[model samples]
Target chain A: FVNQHLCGSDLVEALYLVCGERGFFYTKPT
Target chain B: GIVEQCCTSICSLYQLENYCN
Candidate 1:
């Protein structure tokens, strides 16, 4: 069986950094 | 069942913000 991966606080924070309000997704990629 | 985020929110948002009509 495959192990489950949970989004911990740090991971969520990192996700926010990558895809959140102030993320690269929100800014123009150059 | 697991939720499939699949970069959809980011990709869709990108399309909407940059490429969509």
Candidate 2:
């Protein structure tokens, strides 16, 4: 699942998840 | 399943628990 990959140890996974789903995973900067 | 507990922690870090803004 994307969630699993999102939680993976590799920093790239975290960065990918963050950037790929910015509004879904984080606040959209105003 | 095993991912539920982390939801709260994740939401906390993302600050989704408070304003939802």
Candidate 3:
């Protein structure tokens, strides 16, 4: 749930940003 | 309360009629 929210923008727009991010999805320990 | 619109638009329909007005 990294960077999953904002202060005064929008929920959908926030999701759009996070979706645009170049992150990763893990299924195990680091 | 806030809600999810969940679609591209409100119309689940298209141009379907008889020449058609």
Report per-candidate DockQ: 0.05, 0.09, 0.02
- lDDT preference between candidates 1 and 3, better one: 1
What is candidate 3's CA lDDT for residue A22? 32
Output DockQ, candidate 1.
0.05
lDDT for position A13 in model 2: 34
- Expressed as tens digits, the lDDT of each residue in A1-30 for candidate 3 is 332222222433333444335331211222
Per-residue error (Å), model 3, residue B19: 43
lDDT score, candidate 1, position A12: 41
Candidate 1: regions farther than 4 A off: A1-7, A22-30, B1-21
TM-score (all chains, Cα) for each model: 0.27, 0.22, 0.22
How well does candidate 3 match the true structure in TM-score terms? 0.22
TM-score of chain B of each: 0.25, 0.19, 0.15
